[model samples]
Target: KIEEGKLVIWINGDKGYNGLAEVGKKFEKDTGIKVTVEHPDKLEEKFPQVAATGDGPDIIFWAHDRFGGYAQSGLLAEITPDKAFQDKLYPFTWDAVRYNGKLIAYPIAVEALSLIYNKDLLPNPPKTWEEIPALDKELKAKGKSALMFNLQEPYFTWPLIAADGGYAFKYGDIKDVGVDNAGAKAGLTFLVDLIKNKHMNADTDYSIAEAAFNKGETAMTINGPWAWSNIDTSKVNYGVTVLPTFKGQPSKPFVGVLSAGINAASPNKELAKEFLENYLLTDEGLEAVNKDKPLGAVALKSYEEELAKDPRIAATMENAQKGEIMPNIPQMSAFWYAVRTAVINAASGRQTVDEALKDAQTRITK
Candidate 1:
């Protein structure tokens, strides 16, 4: 029966696709199920359109954030993992794929920001946010900056907000936006002070931040793993570590999980479930998928133990463990833009911290 069956998968046409294809070949050999993989231009946009009409692939290899919107629209099927299977994975990976207390997908990878500093400049990264100002003074004397990051972007700023107790939403309730509390004000004030006191530049965005750090004009930067690929390794002696703390609390980045979701309308739910659980999530299968380069810290405990042997991977997982799993609610669509403008306005001195955050909370609610 398995040999007569066929399944289709849709994935982005990046390095990850190649990796998946490699593992898919092994899966086909083991189960004799014909597997076809497709990469449509803008699969995120196209998959949803087709899935809504009940004409999409059996599996969609995508990031977890979009799962909320798709699952809410009935575009995704709930994936049920047994207790033993659940216990084999990292706890946060489950949180990434769950919706309304049900598992919605099989988590594959994770991402979060970390402190990447020039080892030549600072042998050890700052332990607290307060230490950055002092580093700035020393670096500024030599025409360099202590830190650089995309201050205008909410993704980068959220950790700072969270460090002071601000949140985009109530811990569990999506309907309750929490951007304008005393904690938010405190966090924004710290950021504003950094700009006003010459600790960081208000106008710096991703381009400016990466360029300066690569050119050795900045000693440290807050960024994710994607930024690592762009750094000219030959010139930059860099080291990665967890983000610095604020007022004794570790800065928590937004942890993002990449996953594979079964299409709700799939005619072969039973087969699909078998392929994912027995083949895809298995040790040998996941190893092939990660053969090119291990995809984040995989959800499997055994895989993670192997990955932890590498210090770079260890640093990444360390930051992720300290981060809050990103809320995969449709309301998050509004949260980013609102907080982005607020952070930019406050950092640029266009509004007081309280005013900017209050406006952000209002925008989120509306």
Candidate 2:
């Protein structure tokens, strides 16, 4: 029988706008199930009002970090008894969808990053924080920068800080930074030293840094899978290596996943459930996920087993297995800007490393 009614989908931002829109169109045509994808750039203003009135879309493609807030407020439908699905997913991938025993979303793509380096410049990528400074010393002697990264982005800096033995939040203490920890101080100091000594340069944004690295003007940069096309493989030799370790352990960067979920107030909950079960869980759906960029897969073992053969993106999935998810806790909004401010203040010499981090710790804690 033909599907009875239209199932609306709300897609936020242009991040995956075109790809998902195409997929939704195809799915609708194939199934005779009407899918009206609402791609509103102003979702921050629109989603809440629609959801409040029980007029929200049946399906949503949302960021995993918001799962905690949605779950806490009972705004997202829970995906339970799907432990089999959860068990097959990558640990970091599943962690993004989890909140207080509630699985609020189904992952669509994993955003795992790597330290992209021009092999012609470094020959070998550094594997630890200790190696970074050493590489800096070598670049200085050569009157060149060995590496550059964005200290202005806390979203970017958290992984670096963690690699150096610091963490933004203590276990179970979502807002408290273990800032006083020696490891955290060392991580903060390391960047300060780089800026102060001019051993490395700061990237205003990933694009500028990627453009330089792709052209072989820079040695290395910390960036994500999105940078894959920015670097022209024909222009120069480049390599993707896992972010380096510190204190005998690798630095764990933020792992972000784009997930699919049923809106709590969606009128077509049964249709949405059918989509998740029959469409999403099938091999065809898993293969269709992120066809635009073959980063990580939602099907834990299947994605790895199939796509690992991809030379350029294989390491992304493998490396993500070693990282941590960007926090899903609601209190993390305060922590996000606070962390960004600390990195920027310290990088620009506006504040001492200790002073900046101290303020950050206080602000997030408050």
Candidate 3:
């Protein structure tokens, strides 16, 4: 039963755009199959529970990181792209959706955080870590802060925390945890020192930090293209650029692939696969997803010329080359809370950097 020729999918969220419904209409018009695009809260929580019971949406669209758990637990069906179509996307994207040597999804876009700064405040982004203080002082003199980001989040601060060769995991080898490595310790210490000197607020969160930048109270922020719509670019005179160097190395953020995959238990498995590989993953489909706003660096080879033409997309693509794909193993879930607690505790005077990181490493290892 095709459920009256209708197919359901879980979109990550609305993302401040109405392009999804319009594009969905086109898919229905062309294929005569209706797509009920869903945006449900606590998807990460609800998905596994519903999926394990063999009842869930036919397609799961989300960041590549989340799919590893599905694949590991046999909730996702394995997919193989034809050679003709396999090379259409960036290679690292493939790595993000693959687990244990099987393809779990088709990538839609590649995202990496960048230094989005007020061009009016600072003509150019800071070129080196040491130069940050100069900018900090300049902002202070003008009643602004040089930078602010969501504190205690490894995602936003990963570039800084991993600047000197720190990584949460070694690619696909999740067993080799690197949270407490010397490089990470150095990075954590540098961040703590910045907090000690009052460069940024340790208590600031994502909403407050973003609010400061949007209100012109902060000169710079670390975020990706997804923040573009929320930000009035012209009002801020903002520009996105690669993160500055730290310890003689350029700061590198984790790259994630926004992807879609088929549910192994879907009653509409064959049709779902057809829709995924045929309609949803096509160039036209990608354009529809980005119809209202740019979806960062879309992972299609056909977008090469268009990607480079846009300065924002170009900056994101450049950063992608310098970044490592976030490890998509099931164990990565264990890596998050430990690291988050480590940074928050270390910055808030609850523990030394060494003790914090060592504890994080121990929690992950076990």
Best candidate, lDDT-wise?
1
Compared with the true structure, model 3 gives a TM-score of: 0.89
Location of the lowest summed lDDT over 10 successive residues in candidate 3? 14-23
Q: Compose the digit string of candidate 1's lDDT tens values, residues 1-366.
A: 112267888877763666667767877887787787788889999878888887889989888988988998989999888998888888888888888777899987788898899999889888899888998998888888899999878898788888877776654487687689977778778889988997877888899999889998889998987777778563898988888989888787898888889988888788778877877787776777777655766777877888778777788889989887888888897899888888888877788889988898888888
lDDT of 2 by residue, 15-69 (tens): 5555555556666877887666677877645665666666667777777777676
Q: Indicate the residue-level lDDT of 83 in model 2.
A: 63
Model 1's number of clashes is: 0
Show the lowest summed lDDT stretch of 10 residues, model 1: 1-10
Residue-pair clashes per candidate, as listed?
A: 0, 2, 0
Q: What lDDT score belongs to each candidate, Candidate 1 first?
A: 0.82, 0.69, 0.81
Candidate 2 TM-score versus the reference = 0.87
Clashes of 3: 0
lDDT of 3 by residue, 130-217 (tens): 6887779878987989999898588887788888988887867767888899988988898898899989779988999888999899
- Judged by lDDT against the true structure, how good is candidate 3? 0.81
By lDDT, is 2 or 3 better? Answer: 3
